[PDB]
Design a protein around this ligand. Structure first.
Ligand SMILES: CC(C)CCC[C@@H](C)[C@H]1CC[C@H]2[C@@H]3CC=C4C[C@@H](OC(=O)CCC(=O)O)CC[C@]4(C)[C@H]3CC[C@]12C
Ligand SMILES: CC(C)CCC[C@@H](C)[C@H]1CC[C@H]2[C@@H]3CC=C4C[C@@H](OC(=O)CCC(=O)O)CC[C@]4(C)[C@H]3CC[C@]12C
Ligand code: ALF
Length: 1036
């Protein structure tokens, strides 16, 4: 639901709010950006909605929009207009102003729209542009640099500069600048992609009232305006309803289907016009009209219906710009994790205050010594690391051909638990391939002929090459893909309609009755030179055609062969012929009725057509089902063809039962009945239909979960029932992700948590993901990279936690002995080592196989916290060992406690602690990068391995080479070399210890975790249903 609230303006309250927020503190601003309702309530006085100058749109989410005027007083929410309807005293969207007008009104608006009315409709409906907002670089900076994170970073910069650590402040400024430039680049790239995608502006002629055709801009169209389409065609500027002629629209930009479409005129009547009912008569926005022709009148007319964000492209782009929140939260208990790690920072700050009180430090300096130690545990390179993870994920995906528009969907692509599929184009080849035609020799069937070219010239070959409705569109046949394929198999070329022999007289079409879905058959009138009389060829459903055929012509084995072909996934169409005593001429042929031609036929043969399975589909389905990711087929084809594809493409192993569930329609006096009829060739599937699924949704919402938990084949599903089913599967807490390609799928590719549009261009609005390949090989390529990304994010968070705690423990061990870490040593640690490593750690790709082990989803998980705590105990052990070992050395002399750093610094203690700590960082960085089973191993991204090698070598130089950078960094020059080798031995001990500890945890700890307290039950609803079914199977 939503809610509105008016806030009539007043300047005194506004200026009071501004001065209070600016003078008081940033904390009120922080709680405001966390609780904006209180902030907006304090800013301005509530008022009646008819007096508003500011709204509060709610979805509960909070948005603030401004009511503006031009009386017309309107506001734009998410780009959709809403206007002030005076009579109803409410804000009604503009998509609902004229919504509900009849086709007769659309036809009446054919004469156009007068300029005096066009100005009114342009005031109401606004400009006909999908205006992606343009934000200047200052606006972007105010967007990102006002984050409380960067506010705290600037506070820390000032805090350090007030301590004369200039180089560390420069370091923090440079890292925050890099983070801001990265965020700005990401945002600008997304906005540039969208603004490039939806940029169209042209000049289109407009039908003025009275017939004075006027040319105007494409940004000055209004619903109700009449638009004349160029005879040669062109890009379409706005949705429209055809009111004359036919069109050839290439709707790939809107629905991802590149095949030309026939768009006929609008059928008259008093039925209110619908964008879905009359979807054959509507020309959408952004679709490239190939060629349009006018049958009556000199020009083809379209009456605009939707302009701007109201259109189909406008709606999809409003969805892309303002995506709905993601339901599955990737980092669960992340706040509790950072709290369980901030308790450590608080304990350390207590120790700091205590030991600096004990060290007789000035209180004004104790406050700084504590605030610095607090700001150490806030890593300046956290946003940089996160956005670099997302950028690397996007780039790895784009490098294969998968084009993710907004990168936050990859993490969802990682934890997929269900994957739906189309069938035609996704699993099986897009176009039907004919297996051949079986001819008749008297009253018996002849062996199947794979090549119709080898058929001798006769009624069968002529029917194959002529009985169709193909038309040449720009020197290219267009029409039904089935008919086009059955034509190209014969080798004949279209030249009324005449056809030339492949290698044998041309064949002419005297008359043709168009195919009808209700009649499920079609007939034509065919004549050729040298023929005594024209012949009629009929193609349609074989059982219906055979009825019209002569009983003595139909073989007695017709039914058995038909059953054997149809149940095998083939699509068989019957071809029949009959002589016509009509004189060969176009005049008499045009008078033939369809009823006369259809009757009294002679069966020529059966044309068998197969839809082959792509070679890349079976391995993908097997590698999705051996990783326990359910695979479902949501198709709109037959149920037997779907079942045969699914059983062939690995969705149903030969030993898994598939129980076709059938729901009989509830007649008068009886309810709906579920009857289960199985099939003869996890452990049980169900193959619903479209009507059966609708019946089970309506009547039996109790037996619906046990149908969506084990149902595999969903055939005869209407384009809206695919979305129905995807939503119903999400209601069982599946992370379903659909992978379809055509125009039927684009309804569900939005509802699915990860939609992949199989065959696309560089990008499109149809679905979050796309792809530039034809096979479903891109579903594993998305799941693998989603797992790699969802694991890289955990690795980077863990490294930032470990690297902050290590630096904080180091600074504490130094504060205890009354030293600090210096000025250039902080710069080294937080820029050269840690930022480099954190931004190169995310570069290593995904694994090359899909594993049965799903990545974690919790940051507070006891593996993660046990790892952090054990790594930190080991690091603190190594640093305290180094310190307590530099004491026992003979050449040791303690520092001057009478002064604090950087005065007493350099000294031996700071030298030892920094030397160990700078290695601690690289060791934890290589210890948290775990390749198996999600990522490719560490050495397989040469930037990271070379970074680790160069930094380890440089630090070993610092430890071993005298005078090497020991002046700028202020490291005391240790003369002894045996103690240097002892420090390196302690470093290597920590290296081995960290790697061994991580291996021991990752291997053994899960077993003890299972044994100590096994999971009693799973929160997933589908998991509870799966257990309930394994205990007792539902369909008996
Ligand atoms: C002073 C020194 C020692 C600090 C080192 C910092 C660099 C190692 C970091 C800072 C930001 C990082 C960059 C941040 C983000 C990107 C992601 C990536 O960009 C793309 O994905 C290409 C986009 C496209 O072509 O579509 C390439 C690496 C790069 C520039 C990173 C490379 C390493 C950079 C330059
Ligand atoms: C005396 C000081 C200045 C020596 C420190 C050298 C570092 C600044 C070098 C060593 C490894 C280098 C990295 C090695 C390779 C690449 C890959 C490239 O992509 C981004 C820069 C980067 C990380 C380099 C950034 C600069 C690094 C961190
Ligand atoms: F086979 Al489809 F939508 F392409 F069901």
């Amino acid at each position: 639901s939503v809610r509105l609230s008016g806030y009539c303006g007043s300047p005194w309250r506004v200026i009071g709010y501004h001065v209070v927020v600016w003078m008081m503190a940033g904390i009120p601003l922080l709680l405001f950006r966390w609780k904006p309702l209180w902030g907006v309530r304090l800013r301005l006085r509530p008022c009646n909605l008819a007096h508003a100058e500011t709204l509060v749109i709610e979805i509960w989410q909070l948005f603030t929009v401004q009511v503006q005027t031009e009386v017309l007083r309107y506001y734009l929410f998410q780009g959709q207009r809403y206007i002030w309807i005076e009579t109803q005293q409410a804000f009604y969207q503009v998509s609902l102003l004229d919504h509900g007008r009849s086709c007769d009104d659309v036809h009446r608006s054919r004469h156009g729209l007068s300029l005096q009315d066009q100005m009114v409709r342009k005031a109401i409906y606004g400009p006909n542009v999908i205006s992606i907002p343009v934000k200047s670089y200052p606006q972007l900076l105010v967007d990102e640099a006002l984050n409380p994170y960067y506010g705290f970073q600037a506070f820390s910069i000032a805090l350090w500069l007030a301590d004369h650590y200039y180089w560390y402040a420069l370091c923090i400024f440079l890292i925050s600048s890099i983070s801001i430039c990265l965020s700005l680049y990401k945002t600008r790239k997304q906005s540039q992609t969208l603004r490039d995608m939806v940029k169209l502006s042209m000049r289109v002629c407009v039908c003025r009232p009275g017939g004075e055709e006027e040319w105007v801009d494409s940004s000055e169209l209004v619903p109700g305006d009449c638009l004349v389409l160029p005879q040669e065609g062109g890009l379409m500027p706005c949705d429209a309803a055809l009111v004359a002629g036919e069109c050839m629209v290439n709707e790939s930009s809107l629905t991802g289907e590149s095949i030309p479409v026939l768009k006929t005129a609008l059928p008259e009547g008093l039925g209110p016009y619908c964008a879905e009912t009359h979807r054959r008569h509507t020309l959408f926005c952004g679709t490239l009209i190939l060629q349009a022709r006018a049958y009556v009148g000199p020009h083809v007319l379209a009456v605009v219906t939707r302009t701007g964000f109201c259109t189909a492209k406008g709606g999809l782009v409003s969805s892309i710009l303002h995506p709905r929140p993601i339901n599955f939260k990737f980092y669960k208990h992340s706040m509790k994790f950072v709290a369980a790690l901030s308790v450590l920072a608080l304990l350390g700050t207590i120790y700091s205050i205590f030991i600096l009180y004990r060290n007789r430090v000035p209180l004004n300096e104790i406050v700084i010594r504590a605030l610095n130690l607090v700001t150490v545990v806030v890593p300046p390179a956290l946003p940089a690391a996160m956005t670099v993870c997302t950028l690397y994920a996007q780039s790895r995906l784009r490098r294969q051909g998968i084009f993710c528009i907004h990168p936050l969907r990859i993490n969802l692509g990682g934890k997929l638990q269900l994957v739906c599929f189309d069938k035609t184009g996704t699993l099986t080849e897009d176009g039907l391939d004919v297996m051949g035609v079986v001819p008749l020799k008297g009253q018996a069937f002849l062996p199947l002929v794979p090549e119709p070219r080898r058929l001798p010239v006769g009624p069968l070959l002529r029917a194959l090459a002529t009985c169709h409705a193909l038309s040449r569109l720009q020197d290219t046949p267009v029409g039904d893909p089935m008919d086009l394929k059955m034509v190209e198999s014969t080798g004949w070329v279209l030249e009324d309609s005449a056809f030339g022999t492949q290698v044998p007289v041309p064949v002419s079409v005297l008359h043709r009755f168009p195919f009808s879905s209700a009649l499920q058959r079609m007939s034509v009138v065919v004549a050729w030179p040298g023929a005594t009389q024209p012949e009629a060829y009929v193609k349609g459903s074989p059982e219906l055609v055979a009825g019209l055929c002569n009983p003595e012509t139909v073989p007695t084995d017709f039914a058995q062969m038909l059953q054997s072909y149809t149940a095998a996934g083939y699509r068989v169409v019957a071809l029949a012929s009959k002589p016509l005593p009509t004189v060969p001429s176009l005049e008499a042929a045009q008078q033939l009725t369809r009823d006369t031609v259809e009757g009294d036929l002679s069966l020529l043969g059966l044309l068998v057509m197969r839809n082959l399975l792509k070679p890349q589909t079976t391995p993908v389905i097997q590698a999705l089902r051996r990783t326990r990711i359910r695979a479902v087929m949501v198709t709109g084809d037959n149920l037997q063809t779907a079942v045969t594809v699914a059983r062939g493409c690995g969705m149903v192993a030969p030993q898994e039962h598939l129980i076709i569930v059938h729901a009989t329609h509830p007649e008068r006096g009886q309810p709906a009945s579920l009857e289960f009829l199985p099939m003869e060739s996890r452990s049980r599937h169900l193959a619903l239909s479209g009507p059966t699924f609708g019946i089970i949704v309506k009547h039996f919402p109790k037996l619906l979960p046990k149908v969506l938990v084990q149902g595999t084949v969903f055939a005869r599903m209407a384009p809206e029932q695919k979305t129905e089913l995807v939503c119903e599967l999400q209601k069982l807490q599946y992370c379903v992700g659909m992978c379809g390609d055509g125009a039927n799928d684009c309804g569900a590719l939005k509802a699915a948590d990860v939609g992949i549009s199989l065959s696309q261009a560089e990008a499109s609005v149809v679905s979050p993901f796309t792809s530039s390949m034809a096979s479903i090989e891109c579903v594993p390529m998305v799941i693998r990279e989603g797992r790699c990304s969802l694991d890289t994010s955990f690795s980077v968070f863990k490294y930032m936690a470990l690297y902050s705690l290590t630096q904080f423990i180091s600074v504490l061990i130094l504060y205890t002995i009354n030293t600090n870490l210096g000025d250039l040593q902080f710069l080294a640690i937080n820029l050269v080592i840690t930022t480099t490593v954190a931004v190169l750690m995310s570069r290593t790709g995904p694994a090359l196989v899909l594993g049965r082990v799903r990545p974690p989803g919790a940051l507070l998980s006891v593996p993660v916290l046990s790892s952090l705590l054990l790594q930190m105990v080991l690091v603190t052990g190594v640093q305290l060992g180094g310190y307590f070992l530099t004491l026992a050395q003979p050449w040791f002399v303690p520092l001057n406690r009478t002064v604090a750093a950087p005065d007493n610094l350099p000294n031996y203690e700071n030298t030892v602690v920094f030397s160990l700590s700078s290695f601690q960082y690289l060791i934890l960085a290589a210890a948290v990068s775990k390749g198996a089973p999600f990522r490719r191993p560490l050495y397989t991204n040469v930037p990271f391995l070379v970074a680790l090698a160069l930094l380890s070598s440089v630090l070993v130089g610092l430890v071993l080479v005298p005078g090497l950078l020991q002046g700028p960094l202020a490291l005391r020059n240790i003369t002894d070399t045996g103690f240097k080798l002892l420090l390196l031995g302690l470093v290597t001990l920590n290296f081995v210890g960290a790697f061994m500890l991580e291996s021991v945890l990752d291997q053994c700890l899960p077993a003890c975790l299972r044994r100590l307290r096994p999971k009693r039950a799973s929160k997933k609803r589908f998991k509870q249903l799966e257990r309930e079914l394994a205990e007792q199977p539902w369909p008996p």
